[PDB]
Amino acid sequence: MNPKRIRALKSGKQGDGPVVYWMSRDQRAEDNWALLFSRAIAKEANVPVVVVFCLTDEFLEAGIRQYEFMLKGLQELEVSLSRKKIPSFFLRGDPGEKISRFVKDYNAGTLVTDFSPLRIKNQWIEKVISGISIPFFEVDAHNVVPCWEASQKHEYAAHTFRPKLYALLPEFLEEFPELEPNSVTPEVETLSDVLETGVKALLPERALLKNKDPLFEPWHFEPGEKAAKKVMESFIADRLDSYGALRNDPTKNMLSNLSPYLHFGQISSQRVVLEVEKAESNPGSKKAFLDEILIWKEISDNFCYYNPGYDGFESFPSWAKESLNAHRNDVRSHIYTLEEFEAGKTHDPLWNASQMELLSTGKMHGYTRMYWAKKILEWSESPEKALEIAICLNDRYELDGRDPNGYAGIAWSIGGVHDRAWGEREVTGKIRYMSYEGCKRKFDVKLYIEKYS
Numbered sequence: 001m002n003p004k005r006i007r008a009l010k011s012g013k014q015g016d017g018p019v020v021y022w023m024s025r026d027q028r029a030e031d032n033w034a035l036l037f038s039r040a041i042a043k044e045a046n047v048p049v050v051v052v053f054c055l056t057d058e059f060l061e062a063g064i065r066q067y068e069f070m071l072k073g074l075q076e077l078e079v080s081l082s083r084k085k086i087p088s089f090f091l092r093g094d095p096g097e098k099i100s101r102f103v104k105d106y107n108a109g110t111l112v113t114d115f116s117p118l119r120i121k122n123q124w125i126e127k128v129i130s131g132i133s134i135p136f137f138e139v140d141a142h143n144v145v146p147c148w149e150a151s152q153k154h155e156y157a158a159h160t161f162r163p164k165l166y167a168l169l170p171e172f173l174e175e176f177p178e179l180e181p182n183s184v185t186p187e188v189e190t191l192s193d194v195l196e197t198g199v200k201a202l203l204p205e206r207a208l209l210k211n212k213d214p215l216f217e218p219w220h221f222e223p224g225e226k227a228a229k230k231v232m233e234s235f236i237a238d239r240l241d242s243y244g245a246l247r248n249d250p251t252k253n254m255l256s257n258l259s260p261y262l263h264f265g266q267i268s269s270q271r272v273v274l275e276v277e278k279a280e281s282n283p284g285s286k287k288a289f290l291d292e293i294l295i296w297k298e299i300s301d302n303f304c305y306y307n308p309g310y311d312g313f314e315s316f317p318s319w320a321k322e323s324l325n326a327h328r329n330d331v332r333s334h335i336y337t338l339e340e341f342e343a344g345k346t347h348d349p350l351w352n353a354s355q356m357e358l359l360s361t362g363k364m365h366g367y368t369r370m371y372w373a374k375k376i377l378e379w380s381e382s383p384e385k386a387l388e389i390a391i392c393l394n395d396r397y398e399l400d401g402r403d404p405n406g407y408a409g410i411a412w413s414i415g416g417v418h419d420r421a422w423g424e425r426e427v428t429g430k431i432r433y434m435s436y437e438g439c440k441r442k443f444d445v446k447l448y449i450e451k452y453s
């Protein structure tokens with residue numbers, strides 16, 4: 001167990017009660033460095049380990065699609081942990097108040113959480129630190145290389161971050177030890193009831209079409225740790241060989257489809273990398289996929305961790321801010337409202353089809369995601385307005401949304417973060433431009449449009 005994966009958030013006097021794993025980002029029982037570290041500390045203190053999850057008040061800012069996907073996975077997780085004699089407690093409310101009250105009530109000895117660089121997690125940590133007196137640790141269970149270890153600062157390009165991460169792969173890319181069960185079972189409602197009341201509160205804002213029927217199709221991605229593994233095995237067996245050649249074709253389902261599972265932590269990216277590394281397939285396709293799940297995924301954590309304003313115009317590179325400022329008063333070809341973007345009511349049938357794939361499946365193809373967000377910049381009054389629209393639609397309708405990959409991917413599309421300058425155009429400036437005709441020369445756009453009416 002590498003001690004570089006864990007960071008001390010607050011020192012204190014250890015109690016003689018159970019070690020509490022405040023699970024948040026990595027919702028799985030296998031391949032969880034945060035849970036394994038909590039079990040190790042619990043063994044050293046001759047005390048059990050308990051898992052606590054907070055059902056926050058911000059779930060009404062998303063949809064049923066993300067709520068059901070997460071809760072149905074937690075229902076499976078509660079059974080997995082129970083077989084390991086590890087009890088799980090699901091609290092409903094503010095983590096600042098609920099975690100502090102749980103620590104005091106259950107006489108917790110040590111508190112551990114997983115790592116997320118998002119602003120809301122730091123808000124919770126701030127509130128929790130003020131209300132506890134026991135040691136508080138956080139463990140990076142999401143990245144193969146701990147975020148604070150891969151680089152000590154913001155990396156402006158993938159080619160500067162790539163050698164740093166690969167140089168540390170031999171140390172941190174390793175197999176997971178088995179989660180040892182608790183010795184004996186130790187000493188706040190049913191998840192089915194919380195799901196029922198939550199869905200009932202979300203129903204008025206459910207995405208519907210004109211026929212009052214729901215837009216979202218839940219059968220595309222089955223939630224849970226077991227289903228995530230089957231998706232990974234199917235990708236390695238059937239799709240990895242062609243990934244390098246077809247990853248930019250939205251008419252082919254050749255991606256791994258792992259992001260909903262990766263976002264909620266229902267599968268470990270380190271586990272996926274281990275299995276891909278030992279798989280025998282096209283070297284170009286393996287290089288391409290590993291570049292996505294290692295370099296681009298973990299550089300997104302790098303971006304949010306080292307840029308407090310990661311969701312703002314101020315985090316854009318200087319060349320992009322100056323370029324976009326120089327074209328602020330350029331006349332835009334079209335100006336669409338947030339409601340027109342949301343309903344897919346633009347003059348662009350390819351953009352509208354991309355929005356329909358997002359509305360119906362909750363996972364837009366990676367290539368059209370780049371086109372989808374760049375057109376928001378082109379058809380908005382300002383770069384700041386384009387950021388708000390793209391973030392709003394991304395976090396509301398993507399299953400993989402509200403994620404460092406989302407803010408870093410949007411910042412790449414609109415602000416050229418982790419990109420270079422291109423030819424100077426009006427409105428968009430030197431930001432990389434993606435044209436409708438350019439897409440037509442890349443893939444069968446007519447089939448993609450016809451698929452998502």
Ligand SMILES: Cc1cc2nc3c(=O)[nH]c(=O)nc-3n(C[C@H](O)[C@H](O)[C@H](O)COP(=O)(O)OP(=O)(O)OC[C@H]3O[C@@H](n4cnc5c(N)ncnc54)[C@H](O)[C@@H]3O)c2cc1C
Pocket residue numbers: 247255256257258259260262263292293294296297300364365366369370373394395398400401402403405406409410412413
């Ligand atoms: C405008 C925009 C919005 C995006 N919104 C999200 C989002 O809300 N949530 C999200 O997790 N990702 C987002 N991405 C990144 C990327 O599109 C998705 O991660 C990827 O498409 C998810 O589907 P997949 O698992 O089948 O991809 P795969 O090709 O099978 O890659 C596997 C994993 O590698 C990672 N990965 C792949 N591509 C990227 C990438 N471009 N950036 C960062 N990580 C990557 C992902 O974790 C991904 O799950 C967005 C990108 C853009 C340009």
